[PDB]
Amino acid sequence: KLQAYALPESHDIPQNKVDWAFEPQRAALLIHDMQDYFVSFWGENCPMMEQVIANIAALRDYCKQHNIPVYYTAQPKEQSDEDRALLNDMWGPGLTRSPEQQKVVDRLTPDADDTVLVKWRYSAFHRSPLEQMLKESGRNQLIITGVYAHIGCMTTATDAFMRDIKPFMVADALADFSRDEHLMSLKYVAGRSGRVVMTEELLPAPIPASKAALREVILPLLDESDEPFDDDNLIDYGLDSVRMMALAARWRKVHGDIDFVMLAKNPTIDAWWKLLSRE
Amino acid sequence: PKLQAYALPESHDIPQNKVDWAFEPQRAALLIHDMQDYFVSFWGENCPMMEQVIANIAALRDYCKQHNIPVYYTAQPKEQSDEDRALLNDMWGPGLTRSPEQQKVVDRLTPDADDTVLVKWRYSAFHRSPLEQMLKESGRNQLIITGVYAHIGCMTTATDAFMRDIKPFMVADALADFSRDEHLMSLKYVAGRSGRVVMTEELLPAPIPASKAALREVILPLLDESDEPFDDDNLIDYGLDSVRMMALAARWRKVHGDIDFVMLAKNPTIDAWWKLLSR
Ligand SMILES: [Cl-]
Ligand SMILES: [Cl-]
Ligand SMILES: [Mg+2]
Ligand SMILES: [Mg+2]
Ligand SMILES: [Mg+2]
Ligand SMILES: [Mg+2]
Ligand SMILES: [Mg+2]
Ligand SMILES: [Mg+2]
Ligand SMILES: [Mg+2]
Ligand SMILES: [Mg+2]
Incomplete structure (x- = not known):
């Protein structure tokens, strides 16, 4: 053994x-x-x-x-x-x-x-x-x-x-x-x-293993001079709303319930990491 | 590296x-x-x-x-x-x-x-x-x-x-x-x-007998006498064929160059030979 x-x-x-x-x-x-x-x-x-x-x-x-x-x-x-x-x-x-x-x-x-x-x-x-x-x-x-x-x-x-x-x-x-x-x-x-x-x-595109990794996926999708805080609305920071369709589809592979709605109602690094974390 | x-x-x-x-x-x-x-x-x-x-x-x-x-x-x-x-x-x-x-x-x-x-x-x-x-x-x-x-x-x-x-x-x-x-x-x-x-x-190859006990173990199978000698007993009295001393001296001459047939034969005992190997 x-x-x-x-x-x-x-x-x-x-x-x-x-x-x-x-x-x-x-x-x-x-x-x-x-x-x-x-x-x-x-x-x-x-x-x-x-x-x-x-x-x-x-x-x-x-x-x-x-x-x-x-x-x-x-x-x-x-x-x-x-x-x-x-x-x-x-x-x-x-x-x-x-x-x-x-x-x-x-x-x-x-x-x-x-x-x-x-x-x-x-x-x-x-x-x-x-x-x-x-x-x-x-x-x-x-x-x-x-x-x-x-x-x-x-x-x-x-x-x-x-x-x-x-x-x-x-x-x-x-x-x-x-x-x-x-x-x-x-x-x-x-x-x-x-x-x-x-x-x-x-x-090429694995699920974020950390909240740090998640920021790294999201930050190049924003039009801005300043990076957002983890509890900032991402749409306020230039995130095209349509990106959440691809994000949800990728993240459904882990949690079958995550869709565009779940992401869109609270579009923050804090809220999304919390969604990806659950066992 | 160094x-x-x-x-x-x-x-x-x-x-x-x-x-x-x-x-x-x-x-x-x-x-x-x-x-x-x-x-x-x-x-x-x-x-x-x-x-x-x-x-x-x-x-x-x-x-x-x-x-x-x-x-x-x-x-x-x-x-x-x-x-x-x-x-x-x-x-x-x-x-x-x-x-x-x-x-x-x-x-x-x-x-x-x-x-x-x-x-x-x-x-x-x-x-x-x-x-x-x-x-x-x-x-x-x-x-x-x-x-x-x-x-x-x-x-x-x-x-x-x-x-x-x-x-x-x-x-x-x-x-x-x-x-x-x-x-x-x-x-x-x-x-x-x-x-x-x-x-x-x-x-x-095995080195010169590391101990007197190691020396005795080399020698005992070369003896004919029913009984085991003391370390001061004449080994030829015990059945050691003298010719054997030639093969013994040659092996020991690799460490101590002076050991020849004469040096061993003049005093054929375990005590005396160990004194030679121990110097
Ligand atoms: Cl193997
Ligand atoms: Cl090497
Ligand atoms: Mg091993
Ligand atoms: Mg099978
Ligand atoms: Mg293909
Ligand atoms: Mg925080
Ligand atoms: Mg935009
Ligand atoms: Mg040279
Ligand atoms: Mg050769
Ligand atoms: Mg040690």
Whole structure:
């Protein structure tokens, strides 16, 4: 059994050595070893794992919509002693004595427009067509998600780096054996092999995670010399009323009751943040 | 960045290894990883810690060259275009390439024509290198890892070796790193993820009997007498065949040069021989 822990937040990501801006047109997504045998080490209905999977799904949806190829790695059910090699010494039979647990988790189910690679080693590049698939498609950035952060995910990151591919480790779309091990993997990549980011940093229009983030969505929509206070009417500050239709439609994805009326009757940063907050 | 000495790991600092591959000299090779003036001079002149590190590597290379174990050096090239160096420029800046005078292996580990020097392009010794092939053709599937920096190049090489079906033996007191924590983490990583972690002394032939009890244990199986001698008993009276003293003196002459057949034979007792080994 593995025990759930608090997933890393923005402040838990150490400052990255490199600066690479995310380029959608140059990127691909990796969903690393998210098979049943591996997520079943947290047991049934683990909220930390449900959070991780939900984050990976968000990223995958964005990717598919934006023509960013999505790759999975899957460890094969049958592995001969010659092929498995030293992994038998390190982990024993692994998934090979639970072959029925080889499928990708239900909520991350591949379709035919994704690519599923047979995974033989920690690095998704080893004994696979991954490097050549990426170079041929003109993709030099790899978004990395899945389990387990410090082992296969971190190894693939370093390997990518060595192969001239820019890794983007996604802090809260990973899980590990332990929090310390998870956080070490982020410190390692941040300092030795690439970018470490939060899921929301790759998404083009995520819901405000803070009232500070909300101000950041609203402020460029106003015509003014002075910024408004949080309890100021936004329409007084140049907000086109029609913008609230798009805001409500975006924010309905979290709270099914938020419409134009709910926003319009009290158009303030204070009132809207209060609406987005409710559990 | 720059670097200060720290307390090198001892036997008790080594975390329990998952695997127990016995070292096999006939199947092994030695990697001396990136031990160039540039990297070592970050510790400053006459660093007592780095002097110990270099001394253990030197002891390992002497043992290897004497016992037909191939010795490999990885050395990063002076000449590195932006295309070849790639993302390492982003990560590290120019690295050694701005230092023509600091390119050679440290004086005390000077390679000879009977060793192999590999151009080191990436963290892993195996990348853009003939290392794996060189090893397979020589029937060598064990790789002794020594040098700098432990958690970066040496740890990646170990993991890459493991993935390429080569058994890494990370040498705890024959590595150095940016910090003690990163050094120790690399030991834990290999120990649970990729191979064996050992002390220099574990790979070298057994040293001169560390105790008189250790001496007695060497000797008792060479005796025929039903009963055990006192430390002052004549050992030839006890069934020791005198010829045995030749093989004993030769082994002890490696520490104390004066010990020959005459010196032992004139007084063949455990007491007297221990007095010789204890000076
Ligand atoms: Cl893994
Ligand atoms: Cl290194
Ligand atoms: Mg589309
Ligand atoms: Mg299923
Ligand atoms: Mg307020
Ligand atoms: Mg307006
Ligand atoms: Mg101590
Ligand atoms: Mg010899
Ligand atoms: Mg010199
Ligand atoms: Mg660990």
